[PDB]
Amino acid sequence: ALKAPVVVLGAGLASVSFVAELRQAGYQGLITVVGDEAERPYDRPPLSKDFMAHGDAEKIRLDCKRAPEVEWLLGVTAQSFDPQAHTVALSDGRTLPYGTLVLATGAAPRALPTLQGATMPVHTLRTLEDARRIQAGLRPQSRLLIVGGGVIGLELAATARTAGVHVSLVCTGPRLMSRAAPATLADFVARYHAAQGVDLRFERSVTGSVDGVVLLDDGTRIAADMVVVGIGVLANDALARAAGLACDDGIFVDAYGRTTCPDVYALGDVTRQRNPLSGRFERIETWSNAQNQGIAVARHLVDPTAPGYAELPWYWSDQGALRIQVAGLASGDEEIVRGEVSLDAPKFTLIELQKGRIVGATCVNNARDFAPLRRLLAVGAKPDRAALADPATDLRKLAAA
Amino acid sequence: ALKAPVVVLGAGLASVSFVAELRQAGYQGLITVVGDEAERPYDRPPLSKDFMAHGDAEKIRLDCKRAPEVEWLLGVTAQSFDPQAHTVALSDGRTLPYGTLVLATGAAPRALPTLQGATMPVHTLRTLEDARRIQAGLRPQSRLLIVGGGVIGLELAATARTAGVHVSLVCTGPRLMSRAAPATLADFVARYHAAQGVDLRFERSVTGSVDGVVLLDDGTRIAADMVVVGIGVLANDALARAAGLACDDGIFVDAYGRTTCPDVYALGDVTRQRNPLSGRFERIETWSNAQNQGIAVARHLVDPTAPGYAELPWYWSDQGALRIQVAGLASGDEEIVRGEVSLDAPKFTLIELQKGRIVGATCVNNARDFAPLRRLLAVGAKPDRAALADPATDLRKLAAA
Numbered sequence: 067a068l069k070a071p072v073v074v075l076g077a078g079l080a081s082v083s084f085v086a087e088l089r090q091a092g093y094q095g096l097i098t099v100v101g102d103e104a105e106r107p108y109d110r111p112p113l114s115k116d117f118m119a120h121g122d123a124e125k126i127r128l129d130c131k132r133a134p135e136v137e138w139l140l141g142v143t144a145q146s147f148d149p150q151a152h153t154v155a156l157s158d159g160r161t162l163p164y165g166t167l168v169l170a171t172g173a174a175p176r177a178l179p180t181l182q183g184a185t186m187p188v189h190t191l192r193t194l195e196d197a198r199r200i201q202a203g204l205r206p207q208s209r210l211l212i213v214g215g216g217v218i219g220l221e222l223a224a225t226a227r228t229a230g231v232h233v234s235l236v237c238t239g240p241r242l243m244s245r246a247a248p249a250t251l252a253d254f255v256a257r258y259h260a261a262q263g264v265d266l267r268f269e270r271s272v273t274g275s276v277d278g279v280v281l282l283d284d285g286t287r288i289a290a291d292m293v294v295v296g297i298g299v300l301a302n303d304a305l306a307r308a309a310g311l312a313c314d315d316g317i318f319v320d321a322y323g324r325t326t327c328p329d330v331y332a333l334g335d336v337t338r339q340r341n342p343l344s345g346r347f348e349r350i351e352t353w354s355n356a357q358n359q360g361i362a363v364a365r366h367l368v369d370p371t372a373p374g375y376a377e378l379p380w381y382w383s384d385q386g387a388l389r390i391q392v393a394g395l396a397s398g399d400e401e402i403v404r405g406e407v408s409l410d411a412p413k414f415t416l417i418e419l420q421k422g423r424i425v426g427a428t429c430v431n432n433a434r435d436f437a438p439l440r441r442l443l444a445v446g447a448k449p450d451r452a453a454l455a456d457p458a459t460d461l462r463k464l465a466a467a
Numbered sequence: 468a469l470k471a472p473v474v475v476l477g478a479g480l481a482s483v484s485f486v487a488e489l490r491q492a493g494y495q496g497l498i499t500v501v502g503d504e505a506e507r508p509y510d511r512p513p514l515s516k517d518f519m520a521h522g523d524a525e526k527i528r529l530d531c532k533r534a535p536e537v538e539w540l541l542g543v544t545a546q547s548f549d550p551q552a553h554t555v556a557l558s559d560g561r562t563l564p565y566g567t568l569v570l571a572t573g574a575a576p577r578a579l580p581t582l583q584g585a586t587m588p589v590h591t592l593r594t595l596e597d598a599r600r601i602q603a604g605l606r607p608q609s610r611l612l613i614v615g616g617g618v619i620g621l622e623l624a625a626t627a628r629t630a631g632v633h634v635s636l637v638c639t640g641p642r643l644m645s646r647a648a649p650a651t652l653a654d655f656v657a658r659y660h661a662a663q664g665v666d667l668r669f670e671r672s673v674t675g676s677v678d679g680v681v682l683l684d685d686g687t688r689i690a691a692d693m694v695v696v697g698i699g700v701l702a703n704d705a706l707a708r709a710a711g712l713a714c715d716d717g718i719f720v721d722a723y724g725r726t727t728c729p730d731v732y733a734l735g736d737v738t739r740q741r742n743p744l745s746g747r748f749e750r751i752e753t754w755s756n757a758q759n760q761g762i763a764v765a766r767h768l769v770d771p772t773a774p775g776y777a778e779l780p781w782y783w784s785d786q787g788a789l790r791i792q793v794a795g796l797a798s799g800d801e802e803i804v805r806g807e808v809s810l811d812a813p814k815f816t817l818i819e820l821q822k823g824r825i826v827g828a829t830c831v832n833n834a835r836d837f838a839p840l841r842r843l844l845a846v847g848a849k850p851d852r853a854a855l856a857d858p859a860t861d862l863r864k865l866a867a868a
């Protein structure tokens with residue numbers, strides 16, 4: 067089952083969460099983690115917000131103290147593994163033996179092929195190195211172009227506007243946050259950013275660029291001092307593909323984190339896994355998944371009687387004055403709206419239902435409602451839809467009653 | 468690796484192909500096959516053609532002679548397996564131990580929820596039992612309604628017309644054969660069936676039925692003496708799901724046939740696997756996949772130095788006067804047409820290219836061209852597009868030259 071020594075590839079949140087849980091659960095054998103970035107392990111969400119704005123990396127490091135006696139090989143790239151020999155080949159010339167190999171290599175931003183041979187600054191925002199580069203360009207009154215409608219770009223947009231940067235945004239879809247966001251939320255978020263001065267361009271695609279100007283598929287132009295591309299990510303599953311594991315933009319795993327290769331597991335952004343609400347396999351790119359899937363896989367490795375990963379998906383996004391939380395599915399056969407949807411002091415809750423059962427929820431600036439809604443969601447609650455809409459209802463009381 | 472005893476669940480083409488290859492490759496340990504149908508193992512393609520027309524099941528049995536010393540438990544359903552205990556629970560009360568478990572349980576026709584409580588004859592066409600039931604209703608001048616635009620229904624359509632049965636067909640898509648068929652082929656096939664008297668209804672959905680009449684989403688009616696539903700299939704992956712394997716309408720496997728559960732493999736229609744041409748995971752529902760994936764998985768189990776499954780997808784469909792063969796992808800950036808596309812003595816070849824490389828081919832009544840085209844496809848050939856179109860070109864010579 068759990069055979070020593072343990073080797074983990076990748077040193078992001080999923081990896082740290084996994085190795086801390088192994089130790090906490092009682093595994094005392096060797097643990098070695100291989101991390102290609104030459105950085106003390108760190109959390110990524112601040113890179114679009116407080117770090118981008120204030121620049122102190124020592125406020126964003128992950129706490130590894132619950133993971134004693136781990137050798138962290140930082141600035142080292144795993145180049146291949148041999149699943150018959152049970153070895154991993156490292157970029158520094160060394161080889162590591164393993165009893166159990168864990169792939170926690172995350173995902174990397176997709177490049178924009180139309181900006182391939184561009185001669186103006188084009189960045190993505192994934193690493194501390196990216197953030198530092200971008201941050202050095204957030205000069206007040208500079209012109210920033212964001213490509214893509216996802217949350218990371220929108221988080222950057224808010225930070226940039228607060229810094230006095232002019233921000234334009236190009237989105238191929240008809241709405242922002244096309245993945246895992248109710249349309250009601252997406253529409254409101256566009257209204258918010260527009261009111262904050264973001265110049266939004268929907269159903270546009272970047273066709274190329276010429277001397278400091280971006281070209282679009284409608285035949286028009288946008289001039290920018292910098293482009294930040296955020297059109298999604300691709301799983302870092304190359305080692306798994308080469309070694310013969312089942313992969314398709316992500317390594318397929320079950321609820322125990324098992325790949326198709328014996329003694330090899332995977333967790334975090336690199337995985338394609340079952341979403342219990344949809345019953346379909348998806349690559350879940352959330353902070354909560356990285357942490358919770360890592361913990362669950364470790365727990366079951368040390369104690370095989372433990373259940374497999376069972377958590378329902380959720381995330382947050384902090385976009386200026388909007389503290390957004392979203393759980394479960396974006397839609398069902400019914401949406402209930404609690405509160406008014408307004409740019410004047412935004413505060414509201416959405417609830418998605420499917421045949422009476424809660425299958426998703428959204429809170430904007432309403433954290434107190436989010437936790438009980440996640441509990442109701444987890445057990446597939448079917449509350450009175452009238453009470454759910456009635457603003458005199460206490461959802462926290464409901465999650466108990 | 469290959470640990471005895473071997474137990475296979477399912478006794479269709481994939482299973483038979485797998486067990487014959489184990490024996491041929493030199494494995495002499497126990498093999499037990501569990502098959503829920505109480506039938507000598509048989510091939511399914513004749514069920515829409517020669518069997519449906521002529522009714523002799525002893526002309527469609529699979530040859531199991533290359534699989535000596537196998538116990539076939541026919542008419543027995545595997546109800547669960549315990550992958551820790553390495554046992555399988557059978558419907559007759561017995562339990563089988565395994566060293567290696569192989570899931571070859573295929574797929575079952577999707578039902579039409581709108582015909583759920585229908586009171587007129589509604590069948591699917593998958594088993595010998597189905598075929599016998601349907602065949603007993605192919606009375607000349609009866610009215611048959613086929614639901615779905617796939618090849619099995621179209622094969623039945625031809626057989627029924629030859630028997631003097633009136634045939635109508637309802638298809639939710641704008642074209643027949645929407646999966647894995649070039650549009651040029653799909654359009655021609657519709658022309659053929661229409662000319663043979665099939666009453667085709669495109670972009671229609673069945674909404675229900677009342678006393679011998681089918682209702683559609685355009686608000687209209689079709690009266691039929693029998694409905695045969697062929698709107699696709701769903702993988703029979705329930706045992707795998709219950710036992711904790713990674714599944715999503717099909718069991719995920721790699722090129723060795725490995726599932727996410729150690730000592731458990733899967734092959735055939737039940738699997739979701741990599742299509743090397745698209746590089747994506749798909750459930751491949753072809754006869755050639757069932758046979759060739761089964762052989763490849765068995766070969767590598769007995770001889771681990773053998774390569775994994777590497778075959779590119781292809782199928783045939785016999786639809787009256789049209790002997791159709793299709794390999795690879797339905798489209799690329801270019802289609803080359805060899806010959807005329809005509810209802811007068813149909814004979815033509817299509818070639819699909821992507822940046823000069825052949826990625827797919829179709830032959831209609833042109834078998835001699837199909838084999839060399841499959842060879843060109845397999846090595847990603849990039850022939851002169853002018854020669855490919857030039858009817859004086861010999862493709863067989865090309866596959867060598």
Ligand SMILES: Cc1cc2nc3c(=O)[nH]c(=O)nc-3n(C[C@H](O)[C@H](O)[C@H](O)COP(=O)(O)OP(=O)(O)OC[C@H]3O[C@@H](n4cnc5c(N)ncnc54)[C@H](O)[C@@H]3O)c2cc1C
Nearest residue numbers: 076078079080102110111144171172334335352353356381
């Ligand atoms: C700017 C930004 C903002 C974000 N904000 C939010 C948010 O608002 N809400 C939210 O839910 N999530 C947010 N996320 C955070 C996010 O969800 C987590 O960072 C992520 O889910 C963590 O997953 P991970 O540990 O699996 O992968 P990663 O964090 O990508 O870690 C994987 C590491 O493995 C390394 N690696 C890859 N290949 C190799 C190799 N061959 N050898 C050695 N190392 C290798 C990678 O370079 C990487 O360092 C944000 C992310 C970013 C970038």
Ligand SMILES: Cc1cc2nc3c(=O)[nH]c(=O)nc-3n(C[C@H](O)[C@H](O)[C@H](O)COP(=O)(O)OP(=O)(O)OC[C@H]3O[C@@H](n4cnc5c(N)ncnc54)[C@H](O)[C@@H]3O)c2cc1C
Nearest residue numbers: 477479480481503511512545572573735736753754757782
């Ligand atoms: C009418 C018809 C026409 C066809 N014509 C064509 C064609 O023109 N071209 C083409 O390429 N293909 C055609 N196919 C043939 C087809 O492609 C093969 O039959 C199929 O791919 C074989 O796959 P299989 O062995 O994996 O699954 P199956 O043939 O479905 O065999 C699986 C068996 O396992 C059984 N089983 C399931 N669960 C259990 C359990 N718990 N315990 C025990 N047994 C179980 C199933 O009942 C079934 O008997 C046609 C199929 C049909 C039905």
